[model samples]
Target: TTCCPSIVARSNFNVCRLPGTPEALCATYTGCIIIPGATCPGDYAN
Candidate 1:
């Protein structure tokens, strides 16, 4: 699975919850890619 806006600037950033995956399966993944403009309200400036 992948997470958009991997870098969260605000404290209330939305979480990316992947369902149908086991806890262990999710734990195995550590790395993530950040998509530009994927941040909370007023968190980043273009």
Candidate 2:
């Protein structure tokens, strides 16, 4: 657990749903969800 995400924050991001395409992503990412923020696979990749 060396990763240091000291100040974790939540945001109202525009992400696409499951089985989505990049072009189609964020374009209409209007699902209205707030999960753990990150910079990798899953919701984090958004």
**Top candidate when judged by lDDT against the true structure:** 1
TM-score of each: 0.24, 0.17
Give the worst 10-residue stretch by lDDT in candidate 2: 1-10
Alpha carbon deviation, residue 5, candidate 1 (Å): 17
Q: Per-residue lDDT of 4-46 in model 2, one digit per residue for the tens?
A: 2121211222123234545333332433323355333443333
Q: For every model in order, what is the number of clashing pairs?
A: 0, 0
Q: Residue-wise lDDT of candidate 1 within 1-46, one digit each (tens)?
A: 2242334411112222344554333333433333454553432321
Model 2 regions more than 4 Å off:
1-29, 39-44
Query: What are the Cα lDDT values of the candidates?
Result: 0.33, 0.30
RMSD of 1: 10.2
Summing lDDT over every window of 10 consecutive residues in candidate 1, give the lowest-scoring window.
Answer: 8-17
